């Protein structure tokens, strides 16, 4: 999330059982990092 | 040529002389703030 300038990221990761489908449950997200970036940010991309 | 001159000359220097020939190096603050989320003050002194 990218909000006044400031981006956010938060995450967590656990172990599933399924393969195509994704988890039911529940499992909150703790922040990561909060950095002053500011850019006008429009579109992304991922990397592998 | 007659009449033209390059302006580019080196400093004049001297191994130690005083005021207006004596080397003096100053630093000068950026502008105005809020331009950004960015912040850089002195630190906010806490207190015991």
């Known amino acids: 999330k990218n909000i006044d300038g400031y981006f956010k990221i938060y995450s967590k990761h656990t172990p599933i059982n399924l393969v195509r489908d994704l988890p039911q449950g529940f499992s909150a997200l703790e922040p990561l990092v909060d950095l002053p970036i500011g850019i006008n940010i429009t579109r992304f991309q991922t990397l592998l | ?48």
């Open chain 2, 1 to 48: 040529g007659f009449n033209c001159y390059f302006p580019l000359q080196s400093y004049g220097f001297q191994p130690t002389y005083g005021v207006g020939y004596q080397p003096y190096r100053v630093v000068v603050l950026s502008f105005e703030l809020l331009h950004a989320p960015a912040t850089v003050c002195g630190p906010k002194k806490s207190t015991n």
